[PDB]
Amino acid sequence: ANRMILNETAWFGRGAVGALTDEVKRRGYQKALIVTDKTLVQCGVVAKVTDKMDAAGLAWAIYDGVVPNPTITVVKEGLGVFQNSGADYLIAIGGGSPQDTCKAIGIISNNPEFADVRSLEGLSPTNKPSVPILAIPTTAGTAAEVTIGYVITDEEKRRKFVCVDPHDIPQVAFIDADMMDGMPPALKAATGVDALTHAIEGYITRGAWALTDALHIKAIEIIAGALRGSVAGDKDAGEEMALGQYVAGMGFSNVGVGLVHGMAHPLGAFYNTPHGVANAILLPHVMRYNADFTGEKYRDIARVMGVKVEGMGLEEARNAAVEAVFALNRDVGIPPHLRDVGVRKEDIPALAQAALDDVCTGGNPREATLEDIVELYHTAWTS
């Protein structure tokens, strides 16, 4: 049998954060700890929520110590602030980095034996549900509001580790493009191709079945339809992106992804590479590697990305899908090679070993060796 973890309650559309104060009152919670980052505070995005909480008369403290590719130190610091604050619930406001940090804090608080943080890696054997989380994404990106996965950086061991736990599922998700509009075009592109990567990897993942197939092929159609428009400042396309990224979440959380995420994670660990930029550069090269092990599925990807596949042979349709991704990356301004984002040639062996051991690689529909991954890094590295 196949398990699906989803949000019991989610609110969708511009003004969705409007529903937060009523949801909190209904659940009888006392005091929030908002988990977020310096930018989202300074930019006024956090105030969009806190102003409504102030008006509703709902108490909150804040932790904005989160940095991109959040570290063990960031988690431990956040858990301390959560403890000193007297909060009884969590509000995650931001992208994957603040939301993953929130999940770790929420989990360790009710599962104190995991306080070293790195011991959460894998299928965390937690006995207790997280401290309730209310989740408000600010990127059109990670779907952390609906997934059971979170990614923390172990700096001592220079690796990103994936934690997978149904106990970390937020009680309510607020998916509001008014929280997303501040994203610089480059961030919309990076988080948008992260979402496309979730949906493409999820579509072809080893554990894929009919329900996740339906969710993923819909997310690919929405994301591929909307991302250029959203990067160009189109407000309706940003709302479409907000839905597409979430629908990708509903799928990949529950079945897995593949070698793109496997190879992206060590780039974050080694260089602090933005996760979506890493995914974006790797994705077409990994799709090529995986192509002959995906059955009819690249035909579907090509069709909902705007290719006429009607009279195409299967290998022709597979190339069309790969080229459609190279073209999207070009159109939204992601550079074509890993060298362009500062990946060192010397590091490929260590990166390849880290990728081989990443939790995500297990879902890849083609079984990757060390030599395959070394070669993929090289192919993606330069022309």
Ligand X SMILES: Nc1ncnc2c1ncn2[C@@H]1O[C@H](COP(=O)(O)OP(=O)(O)OC[C@H]2O[C@@H](O)[C@H](O)[C@@H]2O)[C@@H](O)[C@H]1O
Residues contributing to the site for a copy of itself (CB under 8 A)? 1-16, 18-19, 166, 169, 176, 209-211, 214, 218, 222, 240, 243, 247
Q: Smallest gap, in angstroms, from Cβ of residue 3 to a copy of itself?
A: 6
Residue number with CB closer to a copy of itself (1 or 55): 1
Site residues for ligand X, 267-296, by CB under 6 A, read 268, 275-276
Residue number with CB closer to a copy of itself (8 or 296): 8
**Could you say which of Fe ion, a copy of itself, ligand X, none residue 45 binds, taking C-beta under 5 to 8 angstroms by partner kind?**
ligand X
**Could you say which of Fe ion, ligand X, a copy of itself, none residue 191 binds, taking C-beta under 5 to 8 angstroms by partner kind?**
ligand X
Tell me if 139 contacts ligand X by CB under 6 A. Answer: yes
Whether the CB-CB separation of 262 and 355 falls below 8 Å is answered with yes
Q: Smallest gap, in angstroms, from Cβ of residue 88 to a copy of itself?
A: 17
Q: Smallest gap, in angstroms, from Cβ of residue 194 to Fe ion?
A: 4
Tell me if 151 contacts ligand X by CB under 6 A. Answer: yes
What gap in Å lies between CA 181 and CA 183, rounded to an integer? 6
Supply angle C-alpha 266, 344, 70, rounded to 5. 35
Q: Smallest gap, in angstroms, from Cβ of residue 177 to a copy of itself?
A: 11
**Could you say which of Fe ion, ligand X, a copy of itself, none residue 64 binds, taking C-beta under 5 to 8 angstroms by partner kind?**
none
What gap in Å lies between CA 125 and CA 237, rounded to an integer? 40
H or E stretch covering 215: helix 210-231
Q: In 3-state terms, what secondary structure has residue 111?
A: coil
End-to-end CA distance of the chain: 45
Q: Smallest gap, in angstroms, from Cβ of residue 2 to a copy of itself?
A: 5
Neighbours of 161 (CB within 10 A): 22
Tell me if 201 contacts Fe ion by CB under 5 A. Answer: no
**Could you say which of Fe ion, ligand X, a copy of itself, none residue 303 binds, taking C-beta under 5 to 8 angstroms by partner kind?**
none
Q: Smallest gap, in angstroms, from Cβ of residue 252 to Fe ion?
A: 8
Residue spans of beta strands (DSSP E) within 188-238:
none
* The amino acid at 98: P
What gap in Å lies between CA 316 and CA 319, rounded to an integer? 5
Tell me if 72 contacts ligand X by CB under 6 A. Answer: no
Among 71, 109, 171, 191, binds ligand X (CB under 6 A): 191
Task: Say how many CA atoms lie within 13 Å of 339 toward its Cβ.
Answer: 8
Tell me if 186 contacts ligand X by CB under 6 A. Answer: no
Tell me if 145 contacts Fe ion by CB under 5 A. Answer: no
Tell me if 69 contacts ligand X by CB under 6 A. Answer: yes
Q: Smallest gap, in angstroms, from Cβ of residue 93 to ligand X?
A: 9
Tell me if 138 contacts ligand X by CB under 6 A. Answer: yes
Q: In 3-state terms, what secondary structure has residue 50?
A: helix
Tell me if 97 contacts ligand X by CB under 6 A. Answer: yes
Among 183, 226, 287, 343, binds ligand X (CB under 6 A): 183
What gap in Å lies between CA 253 and CA 143, rounded to an integer? 9
Residue number with CB closer to a copy of itself (226 or 263): 226
Among 65, 68, 132, 202, binds ligand X (CB under 6 A): 68
CA 139, 142, 148, 153 torsion-angle sign: negative
Q: Smallest gap, in angstroms, from Cβ of residue 52 to ligand X?
A: 17
* The amino acid at 89: Y
For residue 330, give the nearest of 191, 187, 193 by alpha carbon. Answer: 193
**Could you say which of a copy of itself, ligand X, Fe ion, none residue 168 binds, taking C-beta under 5 to 8 angstroms by partner kind?**
none
Among 37, 145, 168, 194, binds Fe ion (CB under 5 A): 194
213: left (phi over 0), alpha (psi -120 to 50) or beta: alpha
Q: Using the 8-state DSSP alphabet, how is residue 366 labeled? A: S
Tokens of 226: 């909307």
Spatial strand order of the sheet with 122-123 comes to 122-123, 159-164, 149-154
Residue number with CB closer to Fe ion (79 or 248): 248
What gap in Å lies between CA 21 and CA 46, rounded to an integer? 14
Q: In 3-state terms, what secondary structure has residue 108?
A: helix
**Contacts with ligand X, residue ranges (CB under 6 A):** 37, 39-40, 43, 45, 68-69, 94-98, 100, 138-139, 141-142, 151, 160, 180, 182-183, 187, 191, 194, 268, 275-276
